[PDB]
mmCIF file of all heavy atoms in Angstrom:
data_model
loop_
_atom_site.group_PDB
_atom_site.id
_atom_site.type_symbol
_atom_site.label_atom_id
_atom_site.label_comp_id
_atom_site.label_asym_id
_atom_site.label_seq_id
_atom_site.Cartn_x
_atom_site.Cartn_y
_atom_site.Cartn_z
ATOM 1 N N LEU A 1 1.795 -17.582 -0.559
ATOM 2 C CA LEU A 1 1.052 -16.485 0.037
ATOM 3 C C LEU A 1 0.531 -15.569 -1.061
ATOM 4 O O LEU A 1 1.057 -15.562 -2.175
ATOM 5 C CB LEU A 1 1.929 -15.700 1.002
ATOM 6 C CG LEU A 1 2.813 -16.527 1.927
ATOM 7 C CD1 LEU A 1 3.473 -15.638 2.959
ATOM 8 C CD2 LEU A 1 1.997 -17.606 2.598
ATOM 9 N N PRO A 2 -0.524 -14.805 -0.783
ATOM 10 C CA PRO A 2 -1.097 -13.938 -1.818
ATOM 11 C C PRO A 2 -0.084 -12.914 -2.302
ATOM 12 O O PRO A 2 0.719 -12.391 -1.525
ATOM 13 C CB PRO A 2 -2.282 -13.271 -1.110
ATOM 14 C CG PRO A 2 -2.561 -14.133 0.076
ATOM 15 C CD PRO A 2 -1.243 -14.692 0.495
ATOM 16 N N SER A 3 -0.127 -12.633 -3.599
ATOM 17 C CA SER A 3 0.917 -11.840 -4.232
ATOM 18 C C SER A 3 0.905 -10.403 -3.725
ATOM 19 O O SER A 3 -0.143 -9.839 -3.409
ATOM 20 C CB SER A 3 0.753 -11.859 -5.748
ATOM 21 O OG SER A 3 0.924 -13.168 -6.258
ATOM 22 N N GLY A 4 2.094 -9.818 -3.642
ATOM 23 C CA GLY A 4 2.225 -8.429 -3.264
ATOM 24 C C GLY A 4 2.206 -8.162 -1.781
ATOM 25 O O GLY A 4 2.227 -6.994 -1.380
ATOM 26 N N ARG A 5 2.148 -9.198 -0.950
ATOM 27 C CA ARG A 5 2.109 -9.022 0.492
ATOM 28 C C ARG A 5 3.481 -8.822 1.120
ATOM 29 O O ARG A 5 3.555 -8.501 2.310
ATOM 30 C CB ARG A 5 1.427 -10.229 1.146
ATOM 31 C CG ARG A 5 0.996 -9.995 2.579
ATOM 32 C CD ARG A 5 0.168 -11.148 3.095
ATOM 33 N NE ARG A 5 -0.249 -10.928 4.473
ATOM 34 C CZ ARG A 5 -1.136 -11.683 5.108
ATOM 35 N NH1 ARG A 5 -1.700 -12.705 4.484
ATOM 36 N NH2 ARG A 5 -1.458 -11.412 6.363
ATOM 37 N N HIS A 6 4.563 -9.004 0.367
ATOM 38 C CA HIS A 6 5.896 -8.902 0.941
ATOM 39 C C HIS A 6 6.875 -8.452 -0.130
ATOM 40 O O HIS A 6 6.736 -8.814 -1.301
ATOM 41 C CB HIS A 6 6.341 -10.236 1.544
ATOM 42 C CG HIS A 6 5.832 -10.476 2.930
ATOM 43 N ND1 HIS A 6 4.547 -10.901 3.187
ATOM 44 C CD2 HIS A 6 6.435 -10.352 4.135
ATOM 45 C CE1 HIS A 6 4.379 -11.028 4.492
ATOM 46 N NE2 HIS A 6 5.512 -10.702 5.089
ATOM 47 N N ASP A 7 7.849 -7.670 0.346
ATOM 48 C CA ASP A 7 8.999 -7.114 -0.413
ATOM 49 C C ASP A 7 10.240 -7.949 -0.065
ATOM 50 O O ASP A 7 10.197 -8.703 0.932
ATOM 51 C CB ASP A 7 9.203 -5.627 -0.109
ATOM 52 C CG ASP A 7 7.903 -4.842 -0.052
ATOM 53 O OD1 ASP A 7 7.039 -5.077 -0.919
ATOM 54 O OD2 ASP A 7 7.768 -4.001 0.859
ATOM 55 N N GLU A 8 11.306 -7.809 -0.851
ATOM 56 C CA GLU A 8 12.549 -8.601 -0.651
ATOM 57 C C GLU A 8 13.186 -8.332 0.720
ATOM 58 O O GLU A 8 13.708 -9.299 1.310
ATOM 59 C CB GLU A 8 13.547 -8.311 -1.775
ATOM 60 C CG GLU A 8 13.215 -9.019 -3.076
ATOM 61 C CD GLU A 8 14.404 -9.244 -3.995
ATOM 62 O OE1 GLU A 8 15.431 -8.561 -3.808
ATOM 63 O OE2 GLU A 8 14.300 -10.104 -4.892
ATOM 64 N N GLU A 9 13.154 -7.088 1.212
ATOM 65 C CA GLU A 9 13.858 -6.779 2.452
ATOM 66 C C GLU A 9 13.258 -7.535 3.632
ATOM 67 O O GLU A 9 13.978 -8.194 4.395
ATOM 68 C CB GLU A 9 13.815 -5.272 2.696
ATOM 69 C CG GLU A 9 14.823 -4.754 3.690
ATOM 70 C CD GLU A 9 14.721 -3.253 3.876
ATOM 71 O OE1 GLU A 9 13.718 -2.667 3.423
ATOM 72 O OE2 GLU A 9 15.643 -2.658 4.471
ATOM 73 N N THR A 10 11.935 -7.452 3.800
ATOM 74 C CA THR A 10 11.297 -8.147 4.911
ATOM 75 C C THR A 10 11.422 -9.657 4.785
ATOM 76 O O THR A 10 11.578 -10.351 5.795
ATOM 77 C CB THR A 10 9.827 -7.744 5.014
ATOM 78 O OG1 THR A 10 9.731 -6.407 5.514
ATOM 79 C CG2 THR A 10 9.081 -8.679 5.939
ATOM 80 N N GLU A 11 11.389 -10.187 3.562
ATOM 81 C CA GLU A 11 11.524 -11.630 3.406
ATOM 82 C C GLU A 11 12.921 -12.092 3.791
ATOM 83 O O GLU A 11 13.079 -13.093 4.499
ATOM 84 C CB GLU A 11 11.204 -12.040 1.976
ATOM 85 C CG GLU A 11 11.254 -13.531 1.753
ATOM 86 C CD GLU A 11 10.462 -13.957 0.543
ATOM 87 O OE1 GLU A 11 9.794 -13.096 -0.061
ATOM 88 O OE2 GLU A 11 10.508 -15.154 0.193
ATOM 89 N N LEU A 12 13.952 -11.369 3.344
ATOM 90 C CA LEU A 12 15.302 -11.742 3.742
ATOM 91 C C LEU A 12 15.513 -11.575 5.238
ATOM 92 O O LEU A 12 16.264 -12.349 5.843
ATOM 93 C CB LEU A 12 16.329 -10.923 2.971
ATOM 94 C CG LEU A 12 17.767 -11.237 3.360
ATOM 95 C CD1 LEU A 12 18.626 -11.361 2.122
ATOM 96 C CD2 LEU A 12 18.307 -10.167 4.290
ATOM 97 N N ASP A 13 14.870 -10.581 5.857
ATOM 98 C CA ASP A 13 14.969 -10.462 7.310
ATOM 99 C C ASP A 13 14.308 -11.652 7.990
ATOM 100 O O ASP A 13 14.804 -12.143 9.010
ATOM 101 C CB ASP A 13 14.333 -9.148 7.774
ATOM 102 C CG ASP A 13 14.636 -8.814 9.232
ATOM 103 O OD1 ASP A 13 14.943 -9.718 10.037
ATOM 104 O OD2 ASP A 13 14.582 -7.615 9.577
ATOM 105 N N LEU A 14 13.196 -12.135 7.440
ATOM 106 C CA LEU A 14 12.565 -13.319 8.003
ATOM 107 C C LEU A 14 13.430 -14.558 7.827
ATOM 108 O O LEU A 14 13.383 -15.466 8.662
ATOM 109 C CB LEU A 14 11.195 -13.534 7.366
ATOM 110 C CG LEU A 14 10.173 -14.313 8.185
ATOM 111 C CD1 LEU A 14 9.833 -13.563 9.454
ATOM 112 C CD2 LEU A 14 8.929 -14.549 7.364
ATOM 113 N N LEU A 15 14.219 -14.619 6.749
ATOM 114 C CA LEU A 15 14.978 -15.836 6.472
ATOM 115 C C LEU A 15 16.062 -16.098 7.511
ATOM 116 O O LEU A 15 16.356 -17.260 7.806
ATOM 117 C CB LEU A 15 15.588 -15.771 5.076
ATOM 118 C CG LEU A 15 16.259 -17.063 4.621
ATOM 119 C CD1 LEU A 15 15.462 -18.252 5.100
ATOM 120 C CD2 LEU A 15 16.374 -17.079 3.114
ATOM 121 N N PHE A 16 16.662 -15.053 8.076
ATOM 122 C CA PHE A 16 17.598 -15.257 9.173
ATOM 123 C C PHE A 16 16.866 -15.732 10.419
ATOM 124 O O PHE A 16 15.635 -15.780 10.481
ATOM 125 C CB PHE A 16 18.389 -13.991 9.492
ATOM 126 C CG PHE A 16 19.656 -13.846 8.709
ATOM 127 C CD1 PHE A 16 20.336 -12.643 8.684
ATOM 128 C CD2 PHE A 16 20.192 -14.919 8.035
ATOM 129 C CE1 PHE A 16 21.503 -12.513 7.980
ATOM 130 C CE2 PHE A 16 21.363 -14.791 7.329
ATOM 131 C CZ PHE A 16 22.016 -13.586 7.301
ATOM 132 N N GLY A 17 17.649 -16.097 11.422
ATOM 133 C CA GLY A 17 17.126 -16.710 12.614
ATOM 134 C C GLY A 17 16.951 -18.202 12.503
ATOM 135 O O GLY A 17 16.531 -18.836 13.480
ATOM 136 N N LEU A 18 17.266 -18.782 11.348
ATOM 137 C CA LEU A 18 17.263 -20.222 11.163
ATOM 138 C C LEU A 18 18.586 -20.775 10.654
ATOM 139 O O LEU A 18 18.802 -21.988 10.762
ATOM 140 C CB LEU A 18 16.151 -20.638 10.189
ATOM 141 C CG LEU A 18 14.732 -20.279 10.603
ATOM 142 C CD1 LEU A 18 13.743 -21.105 9.816
ATOM 143 C CD2 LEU A 18 14.551 -20.515 12.079
ATOM 144 N N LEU A 19 19.461 -19.940 10.104
ATOM 145 C CA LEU A 19 20.733 -20.430 9.597
ATOM 146 C C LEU A 19 21.586 -20.967 10.738
ATOM 147 O O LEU A 19 21.632 -20.395 11.829
ATOM 148 C CB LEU A 19 21.473 -19.317 8.859
ATOM 149 C CG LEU A 19 21.325 -19.325 7.337
ATOM 150 C CD1 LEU A 19 19.869 -19.458 6.949
ATOM 151 C CD2 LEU A 19 21.918 -18.072 6.723
ATOM 152 N N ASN A 20 22.273 -22.075 10.474
ATOM 153 C CA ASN A 20 23.050 -22.768 11.487
ATOM 154 C C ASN A 20 24.318 -21.978 11.822
ATOM 155 O O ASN A 20 24.778 -21.136 11.046
ATOM 156 C CB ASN A 20 23.386 -24.185 11.014
ATOM 157 C CG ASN A 20 24.074 -25.012 12.077
ATOM 158 O OD1 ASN A 20 23.859 -24.805 13.271
ATOM 159 N ND2 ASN A 20 24.898 -25.962 11.651
ATOM 160 N N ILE A 21 24.877 -22.263 13.001
ATOM 161 C CA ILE A 21 25.934 -21.450 13.593
ATOM 162 C C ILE A 21 27.168 -21.342 12.712
ATOM 163 O O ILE A 21 27.927 -20.378 12.833
ATOM 164 C CB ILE A 21 26.307 -22.026 14.975
ATOM 165 C CG1 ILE A 21 25.095 -22.039 15.902
ATOM 166 C CG2 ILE A 21 27.426 -21.227 15.605
ATOM 167 C CD1 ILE A 21 24.768 -20.691 16.490
ATOM 168 N N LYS A 22 27.392 -22.310 11.819
ATOM 169 C CA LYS A 22 28.603 -22.289 11.002
ATOM 170 C C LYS A 22 28.666 -21.068 10.090
ATOM 171 O O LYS A 22 29.762 -20.609 9.749
ATOM 172 C CB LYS A 22 28.690 -23.565 10.165
ATOM 173 C CG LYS A 22 29.355 -24.736 10.870
ATOM 174 C CD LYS A 22 29.679 -25.848 9.887
ATOM 175 C CE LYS A 22 28.489 -26.169 9.005
ATOM 176 N NZ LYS A 22 28.871 -27.014 7.843
ATOM 177 N N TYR A 23 27.517 -20.531 9.680
ATOM 178 C CA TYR A 23 27.490 -19.387 8.778
ATOM 179 C C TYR A 23 27.205 -18.061 9.472
ATOM 180 O O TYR A 23 27.579 -17.010 8.938
ATOM 181 C CB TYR A 23 26.442 -19.594 7.676
ATOM 182 C CG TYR A 23 26.642 -20.845 6.856
ATOM 183 C CD1 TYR A 23 26.173 -22.072 7.296
ATOM 184 C CD2 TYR A 23 27.280 -20.793 5.632
ATOM 185 C CE1 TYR A 23 26.350 -23.212 6.551
ATOM 186 C CE2 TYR A 23 27.458 -21.930 4.879
ATOM 187 C CZ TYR A 23 26.991 -23.134 5.342
ATOM 188 O OH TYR A 23 27.165 -24.272 4.595
ATOM 189 N N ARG A 24 26.553 -18.074 10.634
ATOM 190 C CA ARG A 24 26.136 -16.838 11.283
ATOM 191 C C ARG A 24 27.267 -16.135 12.019
ATOM 192 O O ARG A 24 27.089 -14.988 12.437
ATOM 193 C CB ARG A 24 24.991 -17.112 12.258
ATOM 194 C CG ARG A 24 24.102 -15.908 12.518
ATOM 195 C CD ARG A 24 22.746 -16.330 13.052
ATOM 196 N NE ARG A 24 22.855 -17.008 14.336
ATOM 197 C CZ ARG A 24 21.833 -17.572 14.970
ATOM 198 N NH1 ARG A 24 20.622 -17.534 14.440
ATOM 199 N NH2 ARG A 24 22.022 -18.170 16.135
ATOM 200 N N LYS A 25 28.410 -16.788 12.193
ATOM 201 C CA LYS A 25 29.529 -16.194 12.911
ATOM 202 C C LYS A 25 30.402 -15.313 12.029
ATOM 203 O O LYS A 25 31.362 -14.723 12.537
ATOM 204 C CB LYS A 25 30.381 -17.287 13.551
ATOM 205 C CG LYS A 25 31.177 -16.825 14.752
ATOM 206 C CD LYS A 25 32.016 -17.954 15.315
ATOM 207 C CE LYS A 25 31.330 -18.612 16.495
ATOM 208 N NZ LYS A 25 31.394 -17.746 17.698
ATOM 209 N N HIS A 26 30.120 -15.222 10.728
ATOM 210 C CA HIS A 26 30.927 -14.405 9.827
ATOM 211 C C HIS A 26 30.088 -13.331 9.143
ATOM 212 O O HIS A 26 30.256 -12.148 9.450
ATOM 213 C CB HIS A 26 31.638 -15.288 8.803
ATOM 214 C CG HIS A 26 32.882 -15.927 9.326
ATOM 215 N ND1 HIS A 26 34.005 -16.115 8.549
ATOM 216 C CD2 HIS A 26 33.183 -16.425 10.549
ATOM 217 C CE1 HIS A 26 34.945 -16.700 9.270
ATOM 218 N NE2 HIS A 26 34.469 -16.902 10.487
ATOM 219 N N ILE A 27 29.200 -13.697 8.216
ATOM 220 C CA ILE A 27 28.409 -12.695 7.514
ATOM 221 C C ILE A 27 27.487 -11.988 8.493
ATOM 222 O O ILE A 27 26.840 -12.622 9.336
ATOM 223 C CB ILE A 27 27.619 -13.347 6.371
ATOM 224 C CG1 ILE A 27 26.966 -14.635 6.852
ATOM 225 C CG2 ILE A 27 28.525 -13.631 5.193
ATOM 226 C CD1 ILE A 27 26.151 -15.319 5.797
ATOM 227 N N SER A 28 27.419 -10.666 8.383
ATOM 228 C CA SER A 28 26.605 -9.839 9.257
ATOM 229 C C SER A 28 25.383 -9.325 8.506
ATOM 230 O O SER A 28 25.417 -9.139 7.290
ATOM 231 C CB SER A 28 27.415 -8.667 9.812
ATOM 232 O OG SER A 28 28.476 -9.129 10.627
ATOM 233 N N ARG A 29 24.302 -9.088 9.254
ATOM 234 C CA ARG A 29 23.027 -8.757 8.623
ATOM 235 C C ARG A 29 23.079 -7.433 7.875
ATOM 236 O O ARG A 29 22.347 -7.247 6.899
ATOM 237 C CB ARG A 29 21.909 -8.720 9.664
ATOM 238 C CG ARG A 29 20.557 -8.339 9.083
ATOM 239 C CD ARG A 29 20.258 -9.130 7.818
ATOM 240 N NE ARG A 29 18.976 -8.776 7.222
ATOM 241 C CZ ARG A 29 18.725 -7.622 6.615
ATOM 242 N NH1 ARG A 29 19.670 -6.701 6.523
ATOM 243 N NH2 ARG A 29 17.530 -7.388 6.099
ATOM 244 N N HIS A 30 23.931 -6.503 8.303
ATOM 245 C CA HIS A 30 24.015 -5.206 7.645
ATOM 246 C C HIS A 30 25.073 -5.168 6.549
ATOM 247 O O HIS A 30 25.548 -4.084 6.189
ATOM 248 C CB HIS A 30 24.247 -4.095 8.673
ATOM 249 C CG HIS A 30 25.531 -4.216 9.433
ATOM 250 N ND1 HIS A 30 25.726 -5.156 10.422
ATOM 251 C CD2 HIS A 30 26.673 -3.492 9.373
ATOM 252 C CE1 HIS A 30 26.939 -5.015 10.927
ATOM 253 N NE2 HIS A 30 27.534 -4.011 10.307
ATOM 254 N N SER A 31 25.473 -6.330 6.020
ATOM 255 C CA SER A 31 26.405 -6.391 4.900
ATOM 256 C C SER A 31 25.834 -7.151 3.706
ATOM 257 O O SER A 31 26.599 -7.614 2.856
ATOM 258 C CB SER A 31 27.731 -7.016 5.331
ATOM 259 O OG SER A 31 28.589 -7.201 4.219
ATOM 260 N N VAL A 32 24.512 -7.295 3.622
ATOM 261 C CA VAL A 32 23.860 -8.018 2.536
ATOM 262 C C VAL A 32 22.537 -7.327 2.233
ATOM 263 O O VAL A 32 21.935 -6.685 3.095
ATOM 264 C CB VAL A 32 23.631 -9.508 2.891
ATOM 265 C CG1 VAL A 32 22.896 -10.236 1.786
ATOM 266 C CG2 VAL A 32 24.948 -10.196 3.161
ATOM 267 N N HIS A 33 22.094 -7.440 0.982
ATOM 268 C CA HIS A 33 20.819 -6.858 0.589
ATOM 269 C C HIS A 33 19.943 -7.871 -0.137
ATOM 270 O O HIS A 33 19.032 -8.450 0.462
ATOM 271 C CB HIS A 33 21.052 -5.624 -0.280
ATOM 272 C CG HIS A 33 21.609 -4.456 0.471
ATOM 273 N ND1 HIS A 33 20.866 -3.332 0.752
ATOM 274 C CD2 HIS A 33 22.836 -4.242 0.997
ATOM 275 C CE1 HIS A 33 21.613 -2.472 1.421
ATOM 276 N NE2 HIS A 33 22.813 -2.999 1.583
ATOM 277 N N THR A 34 20.196 -8.087 -1.420
ATOM 278 C CA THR A 34 19.415 -9.013 -2.221
ATOM 279 C C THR A 34 19.936 -10.440 -2.068
ATOM 280 O O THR A 34 21.032 -10.677 -1.560
ATOM 281 C CB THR A 34 19.430 -8.598 -3.688
ATOM 282 O OG1 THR A 34 20.690 -8.958 -4.267
ATOM 283 C CG2 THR A 34 19.235 -7.098 -3.807
ATOM 284 N N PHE A 35 19.132 -11.401 -2.530
ATOM 285 C CA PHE A 35 19.504 -12.809 -2.400
ATOM 286 C C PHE A 35 20.757 -13.179 -3.179
ATOM 287 O O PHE A 35 21.352 -14.223 -2.896
ATOM 288 C CB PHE A 35 18.359 -13.724 -2.838
ATOM 289 C CG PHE A 35 17.327 -13.953 -1.778
ATOM 290 C CD1 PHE A 35 16.158 -14.626 -2.073
ATOM 291 C CD2 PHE A 35 17.547 -13.547 -0.480
ATOM 292 C CE1 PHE A 35 15.216 -14.857 -1.097
ATOM 293 C CE2 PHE A 35 16.606 -13.776 0.499
ATOM 294 C CZ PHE A 35 15.441 -14.434 0.190
ATOM 295 N N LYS A 36 21.163 -12.378 -4.163
ATOM 296 C CA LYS A 36 22.334 -12.741 -4.958
ATOM 297 C C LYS A 36 23.611 -12.786 -4.124
ATOM 298 O O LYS A 36 24.538 -13.528 -4.460
ATOM 299 C CB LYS A 36 22.499 -11.769 -6.123
ATOM 300 C CG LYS A 36 23.246 -12.350 -7.304
ATOM 301 C CD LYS A 36 23.131 -11.460 -8.526
ATOM 302 C CE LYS A 36 23.828 -10.129 -8.309
ATOM 303 N NZ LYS A 36 23.683 -9.230 -9.484
ATOM 304 N N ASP A 37 23.691 -12.003 -3.040
ATOM 305 C CA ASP A 37 24.924 -11.919 -2.267
ATOM 306 C C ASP A 37 25.049 -12.986 -1.186
ATOM 307 O O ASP A 37 26.173 -13.417 -0.881
ATOM 308 C CB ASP A 37 25.052 -10.538 -1.620
ATOM 309 C CG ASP A 37 25.378 -9.455 -2.627
ATOM 310 O OD1 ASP A 37 26.030 -9.766 -3.645
ATOM 311 O OD2 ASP A 37 24.986 -8.291 -2.403
ATOM 312 N N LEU A 38 23.936 -13.408 -0.583
ATOM 313 C CA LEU A 38 24.017 -14.388 0.494
ATOM 314 C C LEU A 38 24.586 -15.706 -0.008
ATOM 315 O O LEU A 38 25.402 -16.340 0.677
ATOM 316 C CB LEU A 38 22.636 -14.603 1.114
ATOM 317 C CG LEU A 38 22.588 -15.347 2.445
ATOM 318 C CD1 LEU A 38 22.804 -14.386 3.593
ATOM 319 C CD2 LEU A 38 21.271 -16.064 2.602
ATOM 320 N N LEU A 39 24.214 -16.110 -1.222
ATOM 321 C CA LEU A 39 24.776 -17.325 -1.794
ATOM 322 C C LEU A 39 26.272 -17.176 -2.039
ATOM 323 O O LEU A 39 27.034 -18.133 -1.854
ATOM 324 C CB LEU A 39 24.047 -17.668 -3.089
ATOM 325 C CG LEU A 39 22.547 -17.891 -2.929
ATOM 326 C CD1 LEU A 39 21.984 -18.639 -4.115
ATOM 327 C CD2 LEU A 39 22.278 -18.646 -1.649
ATOM 328 N N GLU A 40 26.715 -15.972 -2.410
ATOM 329 C CA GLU A 40 28.136 -15.746 -2.661
ATOM 330 C C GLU A 40 28.943 -15.890 -1.380
ATOM 331 O O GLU A 40 29.969 -16.590 -1.342
ATOM 332 C CB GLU A 40 28.332 -14.350 -3.249
ATOM 333 C CG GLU A 40 28.037 -14.206 -4.729
ATOM 334 C CD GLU A 40 29.152 -14.734 -5.597
ATOM 335 O OE1 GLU A 40 29.709 -15.800 -5.264
ATOM 336 O OE2 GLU A 40 29.486 -14.071 -6.600
ATOM 337 N N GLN A 41 28.490 -15.227 -0.314
ATOM 338 C CA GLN A 41 29.207 -15.316 0.951
ATOM 339 C C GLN A 41 29.167 -16.735 1.495
ATOM 340 O O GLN A 41 30.158 -17.220 2.060
ATOM 341 C CB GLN A 41 28.624 -14.331 1.957
ATOM 342 C CG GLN A 41 28.650 -12.897 1.481
ATOM 343 C CD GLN A 41 29.957 -12.209 1.786
ATOM 344 O OE1 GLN A 41 30.792 -12.736 2.515
ATOM 345 N NE2 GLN A 41 30.140 -11.021 1.229
ATOM 346 N N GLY A 42 28.059 -17.443 1.283
ATOM 347 C CA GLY A 42 27.989 -18.814 1.748
ATOM 348 C C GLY A 42 28.927 -19.729 0.989
ATOM 349 O O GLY A 42 29.552 -20.614 1.578
ATOM 350 N N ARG A 43 29.077 -19.504 -0.316
ATOM 351 C CA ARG A 43 29.988 -20.340 -1.089
ATOM 352 C C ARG A 43 31.439 -20.094 -0.688
ATOM 353 O O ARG A 43 32.212 -21.049 -0.531
ATOM 354 C CB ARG A 43 29.795 -20.095 -2.580
ATOM 355 C CG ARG A 43 28.797 -21.027 -3.240
ATOM 356 C CD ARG A 43 28.468 -20.570 -4.646
ATOM 357 N NE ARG A 43 27.037 -20.637 -4.922
ATOM 358 C CZ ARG A 43 26.394 -19.801 -5.729
ATOM 359 N NH1 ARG A 43 27.054 -18.833 -6.348
ATOM 360 N NH2 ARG A 43 25.089 -19.933 -5.919
ATOM 361 N N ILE A 44 31.833 -18.828 -0.520
ATOM 362 C CA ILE A 44 33.210 -18.577 -0.097
ATOM 363 C C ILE A 44 33.464 -19.111 1.306
ATOM 364 O O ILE A 44 34.560 -19.595 1.603
ATOM 365 C CB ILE A 44 33.581 -17.087 -0.205
ATOM 366 C CG1 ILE A 44 33.882 -16.714 -1.654
ATOM 367 C CG2 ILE A 44 34.758 -16.761 0.692
ATOM 368 C CD1 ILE A 44 34.175 -15.247 -1.847
#
């Protein structure tokens, strides 16, 4: 997409709604910010 049309917050909000049920039952949307943390919670 053309550069500058999106910030990290809106992109990460768009990324949810597709993750499978195994991960969505624990991590909550208001406990993550940047992409560095979602991978951490997913690995644990």
Side-chain angles (χ1 to χ4, degrees):
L1 317 188
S3 296
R5 196 172 180 170
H6 277 79
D7 318 318
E8 283 204 342
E9 197 180 13
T10 288
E11 183 159 355
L12 179 136
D13 191 337
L14 205 63
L15 187 38
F16 271 167
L18 300 198
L19 262 49
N20 186 29
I21 301 282
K22 273 193 312 167
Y23 303 83
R24 205 159 63 186
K25 205 181 262 286
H26 279 216
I27 45 179
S28 296
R29 178 47 181 71
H30 62 286
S31 174
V32 177
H33 289 251
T34 77
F35 277 172
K36 205 168 66 182
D37 288 331
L38 193 85
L39 301 198
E40 280 282 41
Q41 302 274 350
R43 268 170 224 148
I44 282 177

